């Protein structure tokens, strides 16, 4: 039986930094000098609270803003609500999450579980256009009790005309072995719509990207249109029914793939070999 | 227990007008001189019939065309089917709705319930491009028996590079008190794709925007890509788990929010105060 | 009771050709000299295997690449994996499909069923941009056991600024009689997003486009945003609740319908007459 996420309700503490990178980008990190684009994955269970001690090491104001999770207005990360951070400053952002349940009026409160993301909201403009462009974005996963857990999680961000702010034709590539349970968090940012496509693999267009059983009527897809700040995720069994191979993933807008918004899902046999690669 | 929509089947009569507005726009209204952009909300129960006595008070041909609801071709509101209205003329449009049910072949007929809209189809071009641009659009809600009813309904229309044809940076803003059940009808028109986003709140990507219980696998989202003539709706509990605040809603295409396609969901405490606002 | 698809598991063999057309386009066909744009419909049952003996009759390299179905890397139809076809050459592509079922870890493997498509991947660029533009695309339907079968299937492809590569304002038009069960396969290709809309009809936004019964919460829609390589399908009862008529279907992006990306769903009475047409 597959590993599943247990019941949440833990108070978690975390440090985060925003940093200017040597190449002109901006990234988040859990440690000073280890900022990355995309920023590090934040993964919690429904019911967890997260207190993020956020330090802005940059010479301009910056913030942390999160989609999907519960936060009071004092943690919304906007200039309007006095929620961003001065250069060199520190602020504790609090993100909460809740489980689904019956309200007293008999309606059903949805839980926080899903594939979400965080990003800056004040660099360049009051909607963080410059911060997002420079790399201040990262993924958030909230698990429901009983959600299937993967062997590994990869984050793919279509940010304007880049994947993960990389130069075109430089991937990123990811690797797995036939049979691995691989999780993809797929986020879009910027100005343009995209369509995310994976060769050789498919998933369900629902909350978890997988079906629980035969009663779920969700479309099974391998291609999905996205726009700025959309987030979704899914899991696949690497090579299931198709075998090892260099499986391309790309934006399917023809000029986007033509310019190099493409990467490789490298699915290996145990000996590491990939047929035709 | 929350208020729910009862079984439909009523024949309803309604007057509607299309009018040129003093500022050059065009709007629909239930009363001459009270046209609005967006036009007034039409809300019925599945099974209701609606006879709309429509008067075109303008100096150009205009029509009423509806998405989703049942109409015969004589009410489709197009020039092709001789269904538009001459200047100063009157025409009765008939919209019907039906409940879901079993067909005799054992398949399931879907009902009319959902978030829909109406708009002009002949001003400027034979697809109403000029009419839609000028403001001839409005929302339609069809309730299924047992659908949860809100405290209030707000209509948000991304029409080209405007919200509800307003100048950028002029909202609209909406207000609620913590705990209100607030309904949003979200319609898109024109030339451009958009992504609708709300701070501090989320909904289900399904027919009603809410989950009935734990078996619904729909994605819970706070960001949604839309294109011309898309319509969806949802309900939220204002401030649920997040408290009072000036909660922004905006298009998340970065240049769109930067140019001012943003508004405020003002969620107040009982004393009317909003923290940080 | 409606006709339904039986259990699959047949090995099927098929010949296909890619041909240059006299007008400069490129099309697939099951017979030399009978290539079409879109290419012919491939319809199988979950569990079927399809061996396609593909001949490239053109003077440039070409390939067959399929979405959704199972194929080994040797059938992915890309130059990278040595999977395309030299001018005048022949290659057997193998597509497999599987039924859903329980994995040994207790998770649910999704089946292949759905609305899919095939297209070239090497004409013009290594993502088939030139091949797709010229007409090398076609529909694939994989049926699950018990899926409702239609009276007829029509394929509508929004390819850049054309429907099915036709000149604007030339349809295509389709015909049915009131009460026919009509299936639509709706595919998008190229550079641009679109919104597909049908007058007088609606469907469910799920795998089959129809609801099985009252428990399915999928949105019922008549308008849907699509991007390059999206595919979906649905069935409607022609004229159900609305009667005979010339029912327009069009892209609802206003400049797209204005330029003529529109066609007619001609729903006739038994005597062939169409009111207002
Ligand atoms: Cu925002
Ligand atoms: Cu792209
Ligand atoms: Cu593909
Ligand atoms: Cu955002
Ligand atoms: Cu129309
Ligand atoms: Cu926008
Ligand atoms: Cu936000
Ligand atoms: Cu319309
Ligand atoms: Cu590809
Ligand atoms: Cu279009
Ligand atoms: Cu319409
Ligand atoms: Cu493709």
Residues C48 and C136 in one domain: yes
The answer to whether the CB atoms of B217 and A208 lie below 8 A apart is: yes
The per-residue DSSP string of B193-236 comes to -EEEEETT--EESSSSSS--STT--PPEESEEEE-TT-EEEEEE
Residues B202 and B115 in one domain: no
Q: How far is the CA of B169 from the centre of ligand 10 (A)?
A: 29
Residues A163 and A243 in one domain: yes
Is B189 annotated to bind ligand?
A: no
Distance CA B114, CA B147 (A): 10
Question: How many interchain CB pairs under 8 A, A with C?
Answer: 128
How far, rounded to the nearest angstrom, does the alpha carbon of residue B91 sit from its chain's CA centroid? 23
B220's tokens? 């819970």
A54's tokens? 């956020």
Identify the nearest ligand to the CA of B256 by its number. Answer: 6
Dihedral (C-alpha) A205, A210, A216, A218: value to the nearest 10 degrees? 10
Residues C108 and C169 in one domain: no
Residues C55 and C166 in one domain: no
CA dist C112 → A114, A222, C6, C152, C207 (Å): 25, 11, 15, 22, 11
Closest CA to B15 of B47, B56, B46: B56
Secondary structure element (H or E) that encloses residue B254, with its range = helix B254-259
- β-pairing, B11-20 vs B42-45, is unpaired
Q: In terms of C-beta density within 10 A (0-12 exposed, 13-18 middle, 19 or more buried), how is residue C11 classed?
A: exposed
Residues C104 and C1 in one domain: yes
Is B121 annotated to bind ligand?
A: yes
Residues A96 and A172 in one domain: no
User: Using a CB-CB distance cutoff of 8 angstroms, which residues of chain C are in contact with residue B229?
Assistant: 195, 197, 223, 252
Classify the C-alpha dihedral C118-C124-C129-C130 as positive or negative: negative
Dihedral (C-alpha) A84, A87, A89, A92: value to the nearest 10 degrees? 30
* A55 at C interface, C-beta within 8 A: no
- Residue among C195, C247, C276 minimizing CB distance to B230: C195
Nearest CA distance, B77 vs chain C (angstrom)? 11
* B212 at C interface, C-beta within 8 A: yes
Q: How far is the CA of A60 from the centre of ligand 6 (A)?
A: 27
| Count of Cβ atoms closer than 10 Å to residue B125 Cβ | 17
* C109 at A interface, C-beta within 8 A: yes
* A residues 182-211 lying closer than 8 A (beta carbon) to B: 189-191, 193, 204-208, 211
B159's tokens? 């029409």
Nearest CA distance, C1 vs chain B (angstrom)? 4
Classify the C-alpha dihedral B232-B238-B243-B249 as positive or negative: positive
Residues C140 and C207 in one domain: no
Q: List residues bridging with C10 in a β-sheet.
A: none
Dihedral (C-alpha) B166, B167, B169, B174: value to the nearest 10 degrees? -10
- Residue among B83, B189, B206 minimizing CB distance to C218: B206
The residue among B109, B125, B147 that closes a domain is B147
User: Using a CB-CB distance cutoff of 8 angstroms, which residues of chain C are in contact with residue A149?
Assistant: none
- Residue among A202, A223, A277 minimizing CB distance to C230: A223
The answer to whether the CB atoms of B219 and A107 lie below 8 A apart is: no
> What are the DSSP E strand ranges found in A71-146?
90-96, 101-102, 108-109, 114-119, 137-143
Nearest CA distance, B222 vs chain A (angstrom)? 6
| Count of Cβ atoms closer than 10 Å to residue C115 Cβ | 28
Under a CB-based contact definition with an 8 Å cutoff, are residues C126 and C76 in contact? no
In degrees and rounded to multiples of 5, residue B191 shows phi and psi of -115, -25
From B2, which residue of chain A is nearest by alpha-carbon distance? A105
Q: Name subunits touching C (3+ CB pairs < 8 A).
A: A, B
The residue among C116, C147, C178 that closes a domain is C147
Nearest CA distance, A79 vs chain B (angstrom)? 11
What is the SS3 assignment for chain C? CCCECCCCCCEEEEEEEEEECCCCCEEEECCCCCCECCCCCEEEECCCEEEEEEEECCCCCECCEECCCECCHHHCCCCCCCCCECCCCEEEEEEECCCCEECCCCCEECCCCEEEEEECCCCCCCCCHHHHHHCCEEEEEEECCCCECCCEEEEEEEECCEECCCCCCCCCCEEEECCCEEEEEEEEECCCCEEEEECCCCEECCCCCCCCCCCCCCCEECEEEECCCCEEEEEEECCCCCCCEEEEEEECCHHHHHHCCEEEEEEECCCCCCCCC
- Mapped onto helix, strand or coil, the DSSP state of residue A46 is coil
The answer to whether the CB atoms of A191 and B246 lie below 8 A apart is: no
Interacting residues of C196 by C-beta distance below 8 A, sequence separation 6+ = C156, C158, C186, C223, C224, C226, C249, C251, C252
Distance CA C116, CA C230 (A): 8
Experimental technique behind these coordinates:
X-ray
* B230 at C interface, C-beta within 8 A: yes
Residues A265 and A275 in one domain: yes
From C236, which residue of chain B is nearest by alpha-carbon distance? B109
Residues A3 and A90 in one domain: yes
* C105 at A interface, C-beta within 8 A: yes
B192's tokens? 């451009």
Q: A51 is in which domain, residue-wise? A: 1-147
From C249, which residue of chain B is nearest by alpha-carbon distance? B127
Distance CA C18, CA C31 (A): 10
Task: Please count the structural domains in chain B.
Answer: 2
Residues C22 and C42 in one domain: yes
* C130 at B interface, C-beta within 8 A: no
* B218 at C interface, C-beta within 8 A: yes
Distance CA C176, CA C178 (A): 7
The residue among A94, A116, A147 that closes a domain is A147
* C63 at A interface, C-beta within 8 A: no
Residues C248 and C269 in one domain: yes
């Amino acid at each position: 039986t597959a590993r599943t996420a247990p019941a949440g309700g833990e108070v978690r503490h975390l440090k985060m930094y925003a940093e200017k990178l040597a190449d002109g980008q901006m990234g988040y990190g859990f440690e000073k000098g280890k900022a990355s684009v995309p920023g590090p994955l934040i993964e919690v269970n429904e019911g967890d609270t997260l207190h993020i001690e956020f330090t802005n090491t940059m010479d301009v104001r910056a913030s942390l803003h999160v989609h999907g999770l519960d936060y009071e207005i004092s943690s919304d990360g906007t200039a309007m609500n006095k929620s961003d951070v001065e250069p060199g400053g520190t602020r504790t952002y609090t993100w909460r999450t809740h489980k689904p349940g019956r309200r007293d009026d008999g309606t059903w409160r949805p839980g926080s579980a899903g594939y979400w993301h965080y990003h800056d909201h004040v660099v360049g403009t009051e909607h963080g256009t410059g911060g997002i462009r420079n790399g201040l974005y990262g993924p958030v996963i909230v698990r429901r009790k009983g959600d299937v857990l993967p062997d590994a999680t990869h984050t793919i961000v279509f940010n304007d005309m880049t994947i993960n702010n990389r130069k075109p034709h430089t991937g990123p590539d990811f690797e797995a072995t036939v049979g691995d349970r691989v999780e993809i968090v797929m986020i879009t940012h910027g100005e343009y719509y995209h369509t995310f496509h994976m060769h050789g693999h498919r998933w369900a267009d629902n909350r978890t990207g997988i079906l629980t059983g035969p009663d779920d009527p969700s479309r099974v897809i391998d291609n999905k249109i996205t726009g700025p700040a959309d987030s979704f995720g899914f899991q696949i069994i690497a090579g299931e029914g198709v075998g090892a191979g260099a499986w391309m993933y790309h934006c399917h807008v023809q000029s986007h793939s033509d310019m190099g918004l493409v990467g490789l899902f490298l699915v290996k046999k145990p000996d590491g070999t990939i047929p035709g690669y």
